[PDB]
Symmetry: C2
Subunit: 209 residues, 2 copies
């Protein structure tokens, strides 16, 4: 630290890392970039991959939402108890990222025409995470092992936004349903999730959800 | 170990991890899955995300190509010299993954119609890695620090397959070019890249490259 997240005024790909920071009792600065400012072009040209989020941790500048999640997970000890759990943590997060990418595609490129098929395919897309839960302490703790690795925050966000896209999409999945309830009840996260800086931010940048 | 990769008969998403294993002098088994066997359905159903590669390391079963790369990077000490380089390694690999996803989209969903635009956009997609090179000992070593982190193998594969797609695409990028020549020359890796088990596999599964 100090931590600074530079991003558009949406939850988007900063939602998970924000929940992580808040739940772990960290402080940070929100640098809000408006689409107007973004169109000016100077900031974009300075971003390694021409995109946000941009993350500052002291004198370290990072890009890539999952790089930030892994960085935070690594430095705060939320990356598994050993090399094996760590790999499983990656496997979960890579799974979360795959589905987030299809979600983002639906939202921004084909929402009207594609929503039905997407919702049909959703159960098969969620089953893996229910299954991971079923294989770890009866799904009563976290996605991997008994500590709250960074992948949980990313998974939690993926689940929450899919409840908005397709209400009831977790009804057929007891472990995922209870998982979201439990994690969302953690004191600091609950408070964060209920705050204006979260609630009054749209999930995506195009008005759809 | 022992290491086993379960995959279709293509370079695809296993090319980089294979190069890594070969360059690092590791031994592994290839279990080839034909599309015929895949359509039978049983293996797919047993895969966490219904996809390959599947990776066996002793009694640990992993899925997700990048999870496998990070697993080998972590257990073989090819993941930066400290927490800070590790973050940069991730930032590189996430960038590689983003472009690989676009490459894969082109190949399998829009090759004929999309190629020309994609190749036009390619220079902008490659510059970031040239920029990273120029900020690390003049690009005379590796993509991050002076050790060959796993991310290097993924970047090398990405560059190699794009050279097939758009010959000369690295001519505008002296650092990337020299980087490719340099890594490709590494003895064990050089031998691998020229061996039948690499050369006689197509880059992709639909015969396009
Ligand atoms: N792989 C990147 C993707 C970043 C990304 O898609 N950023 C979008 C907003 S979520 C952006 O900056 N769009 C504006 C632009 O591309 O000019 C990550 O995970 O951070
Ligand atoms: N995110 C996964 C993607 C895996 C993937 O796309 N696998 C393809 C082959 S490259 C597959 O199994 N296709 C068959 C199917 O989906 O049934 C990774 O990086 O490993």
């Amino acid at each position: 630290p100090p931590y600074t997240v530079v991003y558009f005024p949406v939850r988007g790909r900063c939602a998970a890392l924000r929940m992580l920071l808040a739940d772990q009792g960290q402080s940070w600065k929100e640098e809000v970039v408006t689409v107007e400012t973004w169109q000016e072009g100077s900031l974009k040209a300075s971003c390694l991959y021409g995109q946000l989020p941009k993350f500052q941790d002291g004198d370290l500048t990072l890009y890539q939402s999952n790089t930030i999640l892994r960085h935070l997970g690594r430095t705060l000890g939320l990356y598994g108890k050993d090399q094996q759990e760590a790999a499983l943590v990656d496997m979960v997060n890579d799974g979360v990222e795959d589905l987030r990418c299809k979600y983002i595609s639906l939202i921004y490129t084909n929402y009207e025409a594609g929503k039905d098929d997407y919702v049909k395919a959703l159960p098969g897309q969620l089953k893996p995470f229910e299954t991971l839960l079923s294989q770890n302490q009866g799904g009563k703790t976290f996605i991997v092992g008994d500590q709250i690795s960074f992948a949980n925050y990313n998974l939690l966000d993926l689940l929450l936004i899919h409840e908005v896209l397709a209400p009831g999409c977790l009804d057929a999945f007891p472990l995922l349903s209870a998982y979201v309830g439990r994690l969302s009840a953690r004191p600091k996260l609950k408070a964060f999730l209920a705050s204006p800086e979260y609630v009054n931010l749209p999930i995506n940048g195009n008005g759809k959800q």
